C-alpha cells in the first residue's frame, strides 16, 4: 500500500508442492510469506501465475479438486487476502484437467482464468497510459519438453492492439539458459512476433529459477518461475545468443524468489525479489 501512480503486480511461476501432504514445500511457503509482505509495503494490483499451478498433475475435479484449496490456504495472509490473480496453464497443469482451473474462477473470486489463453487490459493511474497483457497457453502453442488459431489470434491481437504497453506471458521459455532452455517452437513462432509489433517483454516460468534476458531489439525476457523449486542448471547457456543474459539466479541453498513489476507513465520496471526479501536485481524497460 503506497500512493504510487503505477500499475503494479507480482509475477510468480511454478509453485505448489502436490501431490502428497501437504500441498506446499518449505519454499512455496517462503514465497507466499514474502509475496504477502512485498505487497503490504509496495502494494500490488494483481498477481499472475506463470504456470505449473499444482505441480505433478494439475487438478482432477473441475473446481472441486481439493488442491485448488491448499493453494488458497498457502497464499493465506490478510495482505493477499484480496489481491486478484491471473492464472496461466503450465505443462504440469496440462497433465490434469485444465478446464478445471478455468472453471475454478467461478468458485474463487480472486482466481481468474477465463480461457487457456486470453487478453487482459489495465491502465496506469495516470490515465492515457494503458497496458495490454496477453496470457497464452504454451503447451497448446508448442509441444517441446492444439492451437494454430491461438498463434493466429495473437497475430491479429498484437497487430490490432493500440495500448501504450504490451506484455506477453506463457509457461515455456523462449530464451533461457537453465535446465529446459530455449523452446524451439517459441523461438520460431513467437519470438518473431514480439519485436515485430513492439512487445515490451515476455514473462515466463518453467525453468525453476530467476533470470532476466534482453535481445538486441530491446524486447526483455523475464523468466521468474521459482516459487516452489530451485534449479542451479545452466546447461543451455550455450543455446542463448551471447549478450542476452543479464541476470540469473538459481542457487541450490536458496528458497524461492519471484518478480515485482511496476509500469508507469514513462517506463516499466522489473525488480527480482528473492524469497528472503532482498532485491537481487532490477532493470527498467522504455515505453
Ligand X SMILES: *[C@@H]1O[C@H](CO)[C@@H](O)[C@H](O)[C@H]1NC(C)=O
**14 contact choice in ligand X, Fe ion, none (CB below 5 to 8 Å, kind-dependent):** Fe ion
**Residue 94, annotated as binding a ligand:** no
Residue 206 marked in a binding site: yes
Q: Which residue is nearest to ligand X (CB)?
A: 62
Q: How far is CA 151 from CA 43, 191, 199, in A?
A: 34, 12, 15
Q: How far lies 17's CA from each of 27, 48, 90, 116, 198, in Å?
A: 9, 18, 14, 22, 36
Rounded to 5 degrees, what are φ and ψ at 269? -110, 145
- 14 sits near Fe ion (criterion: CB under 5 A): yes
Q: Is 207 annotated as a binding residue?
A: no
236 is in an annotated binding site: no
Q: Which of residues 73-92 bind Fe ion (CB under 5 A)?
A: 90-91
Please check whether residue 236 is in contact with residue 183, taking contact to mean a CB–CB distance below 8 angstroms.
no
Binding mask 27-66 for ligand X (x = CB under 6 A): -----------------------------------xx---
- Residue 103 near ligand X by CB under 6 A: yes
Residue 137 backbone dihedrals phi, psi, to 5 degrees:
-110, 105
Binding region for ligand X (CB under 6 A) out of 99-107, 174-182, 227-235, 269-277? 99-107
Locate 204 and state its grid cell.
515466463
Q: Is residue 274 within 8 Å of residue 280, measured between CB atoms? A: yes
Question: Among 57, 99, 157, 189, which residue sits at the site for ligand X (rule: CB under 6 A)?
Answer: 99
Helix (H, G, I), strand (E, B) or coil at 203: strand
Measured in degrees and rounded to the nearest 5, phi and psi for residue 19 equal -70, -160
Phi first, then psi: give them for residue 132, nearest 5 degrees.
-120, 135
Stretch that binds ligand X, among 27-35, 95-103, 117-125, 160-168 (CB under 6 A): 95-103
Among 97, 138, 200, 211, binds ligand X (CB under 6 A): 97
Is 208 one of the annotated binding-site residues? yes
Q: How many residues belong to the site for ligand X (CB under 6 A)?
A: 6
The 10 Å Cβ neighbour count of residue 283 is 16
Segment 237 to 276, residues that bind ligand X, using CB under 6 A: none
Per the structure block, which three cell numbers stand in for 257?
A: 524468489
91 assigned ligand-binding residue: yes
Name which of 117 and 258 has its Cβ closer to ligand X.
117
Contact residues: Fe ion, CB under 5 A: 14, 52, 90-91, 206
Contact residues: ligand X, CB under 6 A: 62-63, 97, 99-100, 103
Amino acid at each position: 500500500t503506497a500512493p504510487a501512480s503505477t500499475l503494479r503486480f507480482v509475477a510468480v511461476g511454478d509453485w505448489g508442492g502436490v501431490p502428497n501432504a501437504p500441498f506446499h514445500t518449505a519454499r512455496e511457503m517462503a514465497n507466499a510469506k514474502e509475496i504477502a509482505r512485498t505487497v503490504q509495503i509496495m502494494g500490488a494490483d494483481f498477481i499472475m501465475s506463470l504456470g505449473d499451478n499444482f505441480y505433478f498433475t494439475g487438478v482432477h475435479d473441475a473446481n472441486d479438486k481439493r488442491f485448488q484449496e491448499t493453494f488458497e490456504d498457502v497464499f493465506s495472509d490478510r495482505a493477499l487476502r484480496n489481491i486478484p490473480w491471473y492464472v496461466l496453464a503450465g505443462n504440469h497443469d496440462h497433465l490434469g484437467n485444465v478446464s478445471a482451473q478455468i472453471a475454478y474462477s467461478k468458485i474463487s473470486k480472486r482466481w481468474n482464468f477465463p480461457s487457456p489463453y486470453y487478453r487482459l487490459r489495465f491502465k496506469v493511474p495516470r490515465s492515457n497510459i494503458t497496458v495490454a497483457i496477453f496470457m497464452l497457453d504454451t503447451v497448446m502453442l508448442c509441444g517441446n519438453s492444439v492451437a494454430r488459431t491461438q498463434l493466429s489470434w495473437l497475430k491479429k491481437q498484437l497487430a490490432a492492439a493500440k495500448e501504450d504497453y504490451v506484455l506477453v506471458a506463457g509457461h515455456y521459455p523462449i530464451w533461457s539458459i537453465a535446465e529446459h532452455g530455449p523452446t524451439r517452437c517459441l523461438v520460431k513462432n513467437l519470438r518473431p512476433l514480439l519485436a515485430a509489433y513492439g512487445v515490451t517483454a515476455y514473462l515466463c516460468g518453467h525453468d525453476h529459477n530467476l533470470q532476466y534476458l534482453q535481445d538486441e531489439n530491446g524486447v526483455g525476457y523475464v523468466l521468474s518461475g521459482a516459487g516452489n523449486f530451485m534449479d542451479p542448471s545452466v546447461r543451455h547457456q550455450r543455446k542463448v545468443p551471447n549478450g542476452y543474459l543479464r541476470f540469473h539466479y538459481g542457487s541450490e541453498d536458496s528458497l524461492g524468489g519471484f518478480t515485482y513489476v511496476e509500469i508507469g507513465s514513462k517506463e516499466m520496471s522489473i525488480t527480482y525479489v528473492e524469497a528472503s526479501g532482498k532485491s537481487l536485481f532490477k532493470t527498467s524497460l522504455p515505453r
